[PDB]
Structures are given as structure tokens and as C-alpha cells.
Design a protein around this ligand. Structure first.
Ligand SMILES: Nc1ncnc2c1ncn2[C@@H]1O[C@H](COP(=O)(O)OP(=O)(O)OP(=O)(O)O)[C@@H](O)[C@H]1O
Ligand SMILES: Nc1ncnc2c1ncn2[C@@H]1O[C@H](COP(=O)(O)OP(=O)(O)OP(=O)(O)O)[C@@H](O)[C@H]1O
Ligand SMILES: [Mg+2]
Ligand SMILES: [Mg+2]
Lengths: 233, 246, 198, 97, 49, 212, 148, 84, 49, 49
């Protein structure tokens, strides 16, 4: 009852915040045009913060609503939540569902993506407020965030000596300048993550393997001639 | 320690590729050639082998990168050729077990442009045998013959220690891939498949993905059961009583 | 034809009501659980649906939804009174930090009445009631009546929620930010809000 | 102020010219061409930092001359070494001109 | 913990699997007399939680 | 199959809502405009998808109605999702007079073009002039200033009836206008030769008309 | 007949440009530079000076091309700095007449990130006058000021 | 469109012609050669953008570099020429 | 539409869908004769309705 | 349809013995008259007539 539920919720929130903070550090000092850093900003919604505090410390003021056996616990949570912030409306949905929503810790968190652009401070990442290359780089950043999170999630269901493969793509890679490509190579190398990139020959990354393609007509049929190079550097 | 790696990608009887194998790099592999050479075609092969679901697979052009569904054509049919086609991956786990995973592709005849797909997996293959050799017969003609799944099953079963598994549903195929550490998450349900495909295709086209941005918490946060099941069990007595009364 | 998801969206039972509300100019905040979720789910298609009327469906950065008509709007337009924007900017000011400890989110009509009288200049107050007025009791009574009236108009817009009883005590929603000032790097909200109110 | 200027270098175009002139003989005699041997012989004529560009350009010129009939055999080619420090190449012999 | 190490750890900790970690174990000494409502065998361990 | 329009909506209804005429029409209809035979585009549209529109609007607790004269309009229910309002008694006087003017074969030779002065002259010919003047001003006794005030109120109400679609002004002259069949709704209290009280009861029961 | 041509493009007080003039070519003009240098911004300034209809202008990223988004922000406001701004074109008519079209742009104070546009045109300007100098006043020691 | 307005326009004016293309790097050398010959045959002006100088031997080119400078930003422009 | 499609490049979805409207010009001589028939056909519509 | 409307009864009744053209078809297009499946709206498209 009461306090203990609040404590488990608080610890879960704290652990998620800390893990995010650890992921966050790997993305410091990534140069993409005028973008110089990326973050996942995590915050707690007020309407739930006050509820969590009330459930922690003012339980004697609401115990009537919790020990009334005519209604279940999740229903009690929903009714308490409506008692606070009374302006909230309920869409003719069962209080049971609203209760289970309050039981799910994720609903307490607010999430944003921010970038440290140029002379300015931390700004929310909007596509329309960035150049093309900056947008591509930011996308790659968020994708590696997702992959790391998923690997941390599943490892409790995997063998102790198994490490999954990680691989991502990039089409029309010519859109990135040399500095951005150096940044991207550094990221993937530090993350042990493979890349496959396509470019119409405009870029020649010295590290890795390269494949030259040429399409021809042979015996009145389309045929692709392929050559490969690797090991340079 | 010693993360696994993708080792190679093989195409058989695709548009412009009768039989081709790419040896993937440990860090970076770069495809290069003039316009229309076939680069995006190779990436199409990779992803279709990875996620063989025709409801999700949609290879729209890079221009118009973000538009609606639009046409009924998914853009895959034209990349195949008449007859039987294959796409296969070769992987090395942290255990150093060599596993080959792939699909068989065929153009379904009709007015419309539709495709038929069947996944499969092979384990225990010797390091001395390449996929192209498994899937083709070196008949007297100038060009070899691609052999269907029946011939392939007969050919593989003859080998000692080699196991050939042929799947009836995508769920089983993804389950096996996860158990062997080829993907980072086991795709429980169609929704999981959709999110995984969102990740891949967003990486493919590039840019800040709209869908990823909308549902950020759904992607970055794991769901925790501990907070819930206590209260489902405590709630059980009331639930049964209410249902009985109704 | 018609996009499948658009047909699904407008087939939903919640659409008629929400349509009615939106056309009226009401703002949908995070408070309206079901309506807000519905808009979040079907925004991509509802924006196109309302563009056919030369009216724009906007999601404010704070989170609330609302409609903005163009000059060629197909929906008959209407416009608020000066006193209305005065009160709106006052409510935006009251969405303060000490508010939490001062009132726990629940205000009274008297708070707003006294704030309005204290903060505004006398000349624009006379312009609101009538230029012939001069510091008289009946003028203040009329101004109180007008304040209640415009507050009810704002309640119609969804800016302010009355607590369900006959007495005039209410809570302020986040959508009141629409009256607010422009924010520049490092600027204090109190100062900029006051600067516009002056 | 008034606009300044900067100029390009034509070293790579010159390199392409030497390579294409050196390679034209193979077509004229229709002599079978092996990328491994040709790259190994041709890289010896330039210093290490420039090898990568030379390899790229040479491959660009060579692929225009005919096709390799072995590609339809279903048998992958091996990775041939072409210099020290560990550079490799993969290509079938060019037979059909 | 993973399924492979689970049996090992469960054998290692034995009956004490479901004890409590408490870094001092002297701060409980005054509280202890009050424990009339507890499992018949309570286990306490000292270390950084 | 799944992801198929028929799962959520009839094809004809979706086809109607996708038409380029719908937003205009919808907007207008909600505003109370009546639709007659002269505005072909709209009328034809209405005719083509009548039942779908009726079914649609039903969602709102409003009836899309078709008068015998061939004109469409909206009648809200008591539980209506859309507000409902009533016309003023001066609007009724001008409405019933416009109705008699439409019927009058004596003026059919005008080809529908009438002048505000002719309307005013007909109105004063039939109704009690001095008693009707009470609505313009409580002190009116036949003074010209008050007569001009009455004429200006008539000019204003007639303009409101134009917005409702009951009368159309000429393209270049605003002192002249043309009638439409929508005016027959002002005769709803007498189209059947029966007891006026019972008729009135029936009308209020149907939601057509309110007392004052 | 000799077809008309665009001679040059001028930007004043844009995001990153104080007063810059690009001289166009008879056939092809290329803009190069690393990501974020300002190429797409130059494109946007040109098109804005060509069609000032604010209802139409919508500068999406190159990614997300072709998606009808109705985005909250059209993306023009951020490309402008505080104060007054300009964008002008110099054109040689088939009649060999020099005409300067352009627009005056200015941010709107207020929470909504709105923009104001006022077109204008100049005819008969002497060939020796450059738009960069015409639109600025030399105040101080080589520290010019822009003028409304 | 130019042919349609032949009637309304004065006889002696031929309207200006100009088009754009962003991210030109998506095109290979052969494609750009085709595009240039098309546009020059039609007296059509073009403005194209690419991170790297994709057209070294045709028309004029400008190189843009952005510098952070005293807590604001400034763009430096320099021209490029085919030969040196 | 024309300029924006050129700027982002490629087959513009909107252009191709309405290609008639963009390419084919309008003719006044056709209208002048069709005015009479327009009156007639309008009248017929009336009657039909 | 232009041939159907253009050529009239008295002279071309000798021409009308062909299986493709008849008078009633003008009224048959009344079905097509009510609503064609136009999609995008600008200016004013309405009907077959
Ligand atoms: N669905 C299809 N139907 C028909 N032809 C197709 C189809 N998809 C691709 N092609 C053709 O196949 C060839 C290769 O196309 P692909 O997209 O792989 O080229 P690419 O090398 O990736 O080009 P780029 O990098 O310039 O986009 C081209 O001729 C293309 O026209
Ligand atoms: N609306 C905006 N608000 C704020 N900053 C913006 C806005 N539009 C562009 N910028 C910034 O202005 C700078 C120039 O962007 P722009 O797209 O013009 O560059 P670019 O050289 O064309 O880049 P790319 O080739 O990658 O598209 C970049 O830092 C971009 O982040
Ligand atoms: Mg491609
Ligand atoms: Mg740009």
C-alpha cells in the first residue's frame, strides 16, 4: 500500500533517468555542421509529480478511498487522480483502464530531443530549423540511442556469452561533407556497429571495403559487373 | 565480448545479378557506381531478407521520400526476374557458429505485380562451401541452373551434420534469429515488426524520422511488469466476483 | 476516393462533437483525455480535412490544439473585444510560479477583478466601460459585470475551467499561453508579460 | 571586400591519362587482363600515400573493356594481394572483349 | 541475472536468497526486539546495496 | 478485406464528402441557408446524394429536410449538437408578404423583379399600419420620420432574409430583387384548411415553429 | 531576339549574411560548401524575392521532400535576423533595360513567428550603381548601416 | 506557357528562364553533362547546389564557409576557377 | 508549384496528376461559340431538375 | 458523343443505321451527367455537358 508503491515507482524512474544519462554522454561533442551535441531530455510531468508526493505523504487524508473494498486498487488510483487536478475530464472510459495507466511508470515521463547549435544554447530539434546534413546526423544519433536501449532491454533474456550484431544503412550518402562522415565513422567505430553506405562515387572513404558497379547489356540482357577493393590505410 | 558480425550478402537471379556475393566489411562497406547501376537494389535485397513481411515492405523512391502510400505497387516486383530468386545472409556469432539465413523469391503470375516469399535457415555448413555453390547447378550450358527448394532440401539433407529448417510463419523465423543473436530484440508481434522496420527504413532514407519523433517514449523506454502484476493478483478476487455477478 | 485513415477518423463516434467544438474556436488541451488522444492519433489526416475549408489546424508547442482561419476562410469568423485580450493577458500573468503555493491551481473571480483594476491604467479602463465614465461606483459595477461576461466567453474558448458549483472560482489551463509574450533566450516570463501589459 | 579566388589541381586527370594510354594495348590485342597482376605492377610506380587513388582510377578504366565470362559460373573470386601493408582486390579475369 | 547463472546463484545463497542487505547491522540491533511480525527465519547481510 | 473503405463508410457517402462542392455547402447549411432550384450546382448535388447527407447529419441530431416545393434546409432537434434560433415577428410580416407576392399572378409580368417600395406598399395595404408602427417605436402616430424609420427596418430585415437565401438582389441594382420558392415556409400555418390551433400544435411538436 | 537574363542576387541582414551579392552566370551557377554553410538559404531568398505570396512559401528540409505536412512553421522566419532585411534581383530586359525588383522583409514582434513583406521595383537606375551600396549608408569608419 | 502568351506579349520581349536543383550531388557526371547541354540549348539558366564542387569546367562557382565569430555567425564567400 | 518542384527535384506528384491543366492552353474562340450552347444546356438542366 | 450530338435527325437518319450512334444516347449520358469522379478542385469543373 501507499508509500511502498511510491518508492518502487521512484526507484524505477531514477534508474531510467540514470541509464538515459549514461547513454547521453556517448553523444557529447559530435560535429554535424553547426550542431555540436545531442541529448535526450527527460522530465517528470507535474500532474503526476504531485500525485506521487500525495501518495507518499498525505495517505491519511485519503485512506477512505483506498481501503473501501467496494472498489479495487486501480480504481482507487483513478479516483484519487481525478480528486487532484479536478479540471481533468474522462472520455467515458472505464476507471479501471485509467488506473492501469497510472500504474505504468512510463506515463510519468516527458521526453524531448535537443541539439547544441552554434552560438545558441540547447534547442529542441525541429527538422525545419536545420540544414540537410545536420538533419541526417541527428537522425543517426537518435537511431543509435534506440539500438543501445534495445540491447540493454533484451540482455536479461539472452545467453551470457552472446552479443548481437548491429548494422545500419545510409542511402545517397553524398549529402554529407567529409567532416560529418569522419564524425559518423568515429561514432560507429566506438559503437562496434557496421555500416553500408551508397554514393555515386563522389565520396571515397579510405577505411573499409569498396565495391565498383557497372551495368551493361550482354546477349541482350542486363548485367552488372562488380569489382572490389579493401585493406587501404 | 567479441560481438557478432555479418559476413556476406548473396543475390541470385535478381534484376542485373544472376549470381553475386558481397563480402561485407567489419566496419564500413561502400557501394559505388553511376546512376541506375543497382546500389539501392542491393540494399533492398538486404532488408527484404532481414524482414520478409509483404505488408511492411515498400521501396519508395528516394525522391518523394516522405509521402503517403500512394500507388498499390510496392516497388519490389520489378527487381526480380522470371523464375526463382534468392537472398541470403551469412553470419558469425560470438560463439563462432556459422549460420546462413535467407528467403526464396518468385514472381506470382498475373495482371498485378505481386511476389511470393518463403524464409529458410541452414546451420552447420562447412566453411569450405559458398552460398552460390549451394543454390546453382553447373550444367553443360554457358550459364548455370538455379535449383528450387526441393532440390536444395535434398542436396542439404545429404550432408553430414547440416540442418535445413524451412519456416511457415515469420514469427518462427524471427524467434530463431533472436535466439542466435542476429537481431537485438525478439519480434513478439506485428507491432514489433513494424517498429523494427521503421528503424531500418528511417536509417536507410536518412533524416529526423517523424514517426520516431512522435512516439519517442515508446521506442526508448522498456516496459516494466513489476509495478503491475502484484495488483493484478490482488485484484483477481474482485474481478472474478464481478464477472460472476454479471 | 478518400484516404482510408481519414475515413476511419471521421467515422469515429467522437468526431461530430469535436467538430462542433473546434468550429466554435475551442482549444483542446491535455485535460480532455479522449479528444486530445484522438487528435494526436489522426492529426495527419485532420489537417488535410480542415485545409479544404481554408482553415488551419495548429498544435501549439505547449501541446494544445486549435484552429486558425485564413483570410479566405469558409467558416464565418468573429473577433474578441479589447477587454477580452486584456483579461487573457492577465490570466497569462497569473499562470505564475508562486501561484502553486498561493492557490493550488484554484482562483476566484475577485483575484482577477482586483488584479485587473490594480495593474491596468485608468484611461483604458474608461475606454472599456465608456468614455463618459469617471471613477464611479456604477462604473465599477458595470466593469465587474463585463468581467464576468468575458470570463464566460473565455470559458467557452476552453481557456478557463469553472469548478462545478454556482460560485465563481476557477482554474487556468495551459492553453492560456496563446495570449502570452514572445520569449527570447534567457528572458524572464514575469518581466516580458508585464512589459506587454504596460 | 572584393572577391578572392582559388584554383583546382589537375594531377588526377593526368594520372587517368597515363593509365588509359598504358591500358589501351590490352583491348587492341584482345589480351586477357588480370586486375591482380596489373595493379601489382602499376602500384610499384607510385608512393604509398597515392596507391588508393591509383587503384580506384585503374579499376574505373579497366571495367570498360569487355566482361569476365566466369561471373556466370556461380564461383566467387578470391581476394588477391597487390602490395605490402595489406591491400587486396577481388575480380575475375576479363575474357570477353 | 541470466538463466545460466540463476541456478548457480540460487545454490550459492541457499536459504539466504531472500535476505535483506543492510550495510551496518548494528543499527538494527535496537530495532530488532520489536520484530514480532516477520518470517520465522530472517536473513540480514552487510554490504553496499 | 481489411483496410477497405466499406469497413468504415458507405462508398457513396465518402464519394459525396470528397466532392469539391461539399465544404461550401456544409458551411452554408449550418448557417441556416435554404437551397432552391436556381442554384443548380448545389441543388443537383443535394439531389444526387440526398440519403447519404441525411444519414450523415443525423449524427448531429439534426434533420436535413426537403420541402414539397423542392428546397432543402436544416431543422435541429431538441438534443441538437448545433444551436437553433428563431426569426423576429417583423421578419414574419415581411416573409408572409413576400410569399403573397410570389403567388400573385397580377405581378408575374415583372419576371420576378420587385422593388422595396412595391413590397412596402403591399405590406401597408394589408396589415394594420398604425398598430404595426408600435414595433418601430412605442410613440409612433404616423409621423414621416417614423415612416422612414419603418422603411429602414424593412430594408435591414430584407437584407437578413437575403443571407438566409430567401431573396436575391440584382447584380448591379440594390433597390430591386427576385424571389425564390423558399418563402413558402411562411405559409406553414395555413397550407391545410383546418383548425389553426391544431396546426400550430403540430408545428411546435415537429420543431418547425416556436411561440413568443 | 535576345532573351532576358538575371544578372545578380543581393541579400541584406539574413541569417549569416550581412550584405552579400552573388553575380549569376549566363548558363550555370554553382554553390558549394560544407553542411550548414548557407546554400539552401540562398535558394530560399531567391524564390522569396520571386513570389512573395506568404500563403505559398514553405521551406521544408530536402529530406521529407514531397510530404504534405502542414508544419507549424514554414521555416522562413528563422532565416531572418532582427531589424530590416532585403532581397533583390537585377534583370536585363530583352529591350536592354535594367530593372531591379525585390522585397523588404521584417520579423513581426509577438509570440507567433510571423513575417512582413513589402515588394518594390526600381527602373532607370544608372548602370554604375550597385544594389549593395544603394541599400546601405556609410556610417563611421567603414561600418555601414542599413536604411529602411 | 511561353507559347501561350505569344499573343498577349509585345512582339519584342522574350521572358527570362530560370530553374533550381538542390542536392545536385545525387547526379553522376554523365547525367550532369546531359542536363547542361539540355539547358544551354534552350537558353535556360540554372542554379544548383552541392557540398562538393560537382561542376568544375562550366559556369561560375562560389564557395561558402561559415565562421562563428564574437558570439554570432558570419559567412565568407570565395570564388573558384577551372584552371590555375 | 513549378518552381518548388524544380527546387526539390524529381517527378513531382502534383504536376503529373493534373498534366492537362498545366500543358494545354485555353482558347477564346471556342468559348465564344460555346456561349450560346451554354445558355441552351443550362436551360435544359433547369427543366430536367 | 460529338458525332451523336452534331448530326441531326432529318438528313442523317440515313447515316444513323450504324450500330454506334443513336439519339437516345444523349439522354443516356444523363447518368454520366450527375457526377463524374473529379478529384482536385480549382476554378470550376462540373459535369459531362
Ligand atoms: N521496380 C523496378 N521496376 C523496374 N525497373 C526498376 C525497378 N527498380 C529499379 N529499376 C531499375 O533498375 C536499375 C537500378 O536501379 P537502382 O535504384 O538500384 O539504382 P541505383 O544504382 O541505386 O541508382 P541511384 O543511386 O542513382 O539511385 C535502374 O535502371 C532502375 O531503373
Ligand atoms: N529556420 C531556421 N532557423 C534557424 N536556423 C536555420 C534555419 N534555416 C537554416 N538554419 C541554419 O542556417 C545554416 C544554413 O543552413 P542551410 O540549409 O542554408 O545550409 P546549406 O549549406 O545549404 O546546407 P546543406 O547542404 O546541408 O543543406 C545552418 O546552420 C542551418 O542550421
Ligand atoms: Mg539509388
Ligand atoms: Mg542547405
Amino acid at each position: 500500500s501507499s508509500k511502498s508503491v511510491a518508492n518502487i515507482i521512484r526507484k524505477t524512474i531514477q534508474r531510467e533517468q540514470n541509464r538515459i544519462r549514461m547513454l547521453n554522454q556517448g553523444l557529447q561533442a559530435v560535429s554535424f555542421g553547426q550542431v555540436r551535441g545531442v541529448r535526450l531530455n527527460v522530465n517528470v510531468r507535474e500532474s503526476h509529480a504531485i500525485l506521487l508526493d500525495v501518495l507518499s505523504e498525505q495517505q491519511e487524508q485519503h485512506q477512505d478511498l483506498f481501503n473501501s473494498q467496494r472498489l479495487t486498487f486501480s480504481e482507487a488510483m483513478a479516483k484519487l487522480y481525478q480528486r487532484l487536478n479536478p479540471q481533468v475530464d474522462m472520455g467515458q472510459r472505464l476507471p479501471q483502464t485509467i488506473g492501469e495507466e497510472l500504474l505504468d511508470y512510463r506515463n510519468y515521463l516527458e521526453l524531448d530531443v535537443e541539439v547544441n547549435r552554434g552560438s545558441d544554447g540547447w534547442l529542441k530539434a525541429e527538422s525545419g530549423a536545420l540544414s540537410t546534413g545536420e538533419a541526417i546526423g541527428t537522425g543517426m544519433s537518435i537511431l543509435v540511442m534506440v539500438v543501445q536501449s534495445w540491447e540493454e532491454e533484451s540482455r536479461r533474456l539472452r545467453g551470457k556469452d552472446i552479443s548481437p550484431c548491429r548494422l545500419l544503412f545510409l542511402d545517397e550518402a553524398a549529402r554529407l561533407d567529409a567532416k560529418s562522415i569522419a564524425t559518423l565513422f568515429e561514432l560507429c567505430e566506438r559503437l562496434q556497429m557496421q555500416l553500408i553506405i551508397a554514393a555515386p562515387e563522389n565520396i571515397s572513404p579510405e577505411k573499409g571495403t569498396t565495391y565498383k558497379l557497372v551495368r551493361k547489356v550482354f546477349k541482350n540482357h542486363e548485367h552488372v559487373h562488380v569489382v572490389g577493393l579493401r585493406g587501404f590505410g | 565480448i567479441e560481438r557478432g558480425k555479418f559476413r556476406s550478402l548473396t543475390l541470385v537471379n535478381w534484376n542485373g545479378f544472376f549470381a553475386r556475393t558481397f563480402d561485407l566489411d567489419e566496419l564500413v562497406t561502400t557501394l559505388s557506381g553511376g546512376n541506375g547501376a543497382g546500389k539501392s537494389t542491393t540494399m533492398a535485397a538486404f532488408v527484404t531478407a532481414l524482414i520478409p513481411d509483404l505488408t511492411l515492405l515498400h521501396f519508395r523512391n528516394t525522391t518523394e521520400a516522405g509521402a503517403t502510400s500512394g500507388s498499390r505497387d510496392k516497388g519490389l516486383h520489378g527487381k526480380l526476374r522470371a523464375g526463382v530468386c534468392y537472398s541470403t545472409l551469412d553470419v558469425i556469432n560470438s560463439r563462432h557458429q556459422r549460420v546462413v539465413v535467407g528467403v526464396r523469391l518468385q514472381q506470382v503470375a498475373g495482371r498485378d505485380r505481386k511476389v511470393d516469399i518463403k524464409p529458410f535457415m541452414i546451420q552447420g555448413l562447412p566453411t569450405a562451401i559458398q552460398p552460390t555453390q549451394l543454390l546453382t547447378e553447373n550444367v553443360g550450358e554457358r550459364q548455370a541452373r538455379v535449383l528450387p527448394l526441393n532440390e536444395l532440401k535434398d542436396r542439404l539433407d545429404e550432408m553430414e551434420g547440416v540442418q535445413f529448417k524451412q519456416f511457415n510463419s515469420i514469427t518462427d523465423y524471427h524467434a530463431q534469429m533472436f535466439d542466435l543473436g542476429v537481431i537485438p530484440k525478439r519480434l513478439r508481434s506485428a507491432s514489433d515488426r513494424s517498429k523494427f522496420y521503421r528503424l531500418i527504413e528511417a536509417s536507410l532514407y536518412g533524416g529526423i524520422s517523424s514517426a520516431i519523433t512522435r512516439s519517442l517514449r515508446d521506442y526508448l523506454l522498456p516496459e516494466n511488469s513489476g509495478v503491475r502484476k502484484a495488483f493484478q493478483d490482488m485484484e483477481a478476487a474482485l474481478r472474478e466476483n464481478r464477472i460472476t455477478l454479471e | 476516393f478518400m484516404p482510408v485513415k481519414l475515413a476511419q477518423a471521421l467515422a469515429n463516434s467522437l468526431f461530430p462533437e469535436l467538430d462542433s467544438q473546434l468550429r466554435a474556436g475551442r482549444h483542446i488541451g491535455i485535460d480532455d483525455l479522449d479528444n486530445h488522444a484522438f487528435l494526436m492519433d489522426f492529426q495527419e489526416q485532420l489537417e488535410e480535412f480542415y485545409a479544404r475549408y481554408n482553415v488551419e489546424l495548429i498544435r501549439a508547442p505547449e501541446g494544445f490544439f486549435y484552429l486558425r482561419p485564413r483570410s479566405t476562410t469558409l467558416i464565418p469568423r468573429s473577433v474578441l473585444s479589447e477587454l477580452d485580450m486584456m483579461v487573457g493577458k492577465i490570466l497569462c500573468y497569473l499562470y505564475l510560479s508562486p501561484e502553486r503555493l498561493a492557490n493550488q491551481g484554484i482562483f476566484t473571480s475577485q483575484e482577477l477583478y482586483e488584479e485587473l483594476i490594480s495593474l491596468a491604467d485608468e484611461g483604458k479602463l474608461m475606454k472599456f466601460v465608456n468614455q463618459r465614465s469617471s471613477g464611479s461606483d456604477l462604473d465599477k459595477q458595470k466593469l465587474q459585470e463585463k468581467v464576468r461576461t468575458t470570463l464566460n466567453r473565455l470559458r467557452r474558448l476552453g481557456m478557463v475551467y469553472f469548478l462545478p458549483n454556482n460560485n465563481n472560482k476557477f482554474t487556468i489551463t495551459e492553453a492560456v499561453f496563446r495570449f502570452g509574450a514572445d520569449v527570447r533566450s534567457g528572458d524572464d516570463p514575469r518581466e516580458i508579460q508585464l512589459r506587454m501589459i504596460r | 571586400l572584393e572577391l578572392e579566388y582559388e584554383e583546382f589541381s589537375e594531377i588526377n586527370d593526368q594520372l587517368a591519362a597515363m593509365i588509359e594510354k598504358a591500358l589501351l594495348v590490352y583491348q587492341q590485342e584482345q589480351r586477357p587482363l588480370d586486375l591482380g597482376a596489373v595493379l601489382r605492377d602499376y602500384l610499384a610506380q607510385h608512393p604509398l600515400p597515392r596507391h588508393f587513388d591509383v587503384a580506384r582510377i585503374l579499376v574505373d578504366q579497366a571495367v570498360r573493356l569487355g566482361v569476365a565470362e566466369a561471373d556466370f559460373s556461380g564461383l566467387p573470386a578470391e581476394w588477391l594481394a597487390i602490395n605490402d601493408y595489406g591491400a587486396k582486390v577481388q575480380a575475375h579475369v576479363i575474357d570477353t572483349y | 541475472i541470466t538463466i545460466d547463472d540463476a541456478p548457480y546463484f540460487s545454490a550459492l545463497y541457499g536459504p539466504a536468497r531472500h535476505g535483506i542487505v543492510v550495510p551496518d547491522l548494528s543499527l538494527v540491533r535496537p530495532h530488532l526486539e520489536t520484530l514480532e511480525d516477520c518470517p520465522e527465519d530472517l536473513y540480514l547481510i552487510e554490504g553496499d546495496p
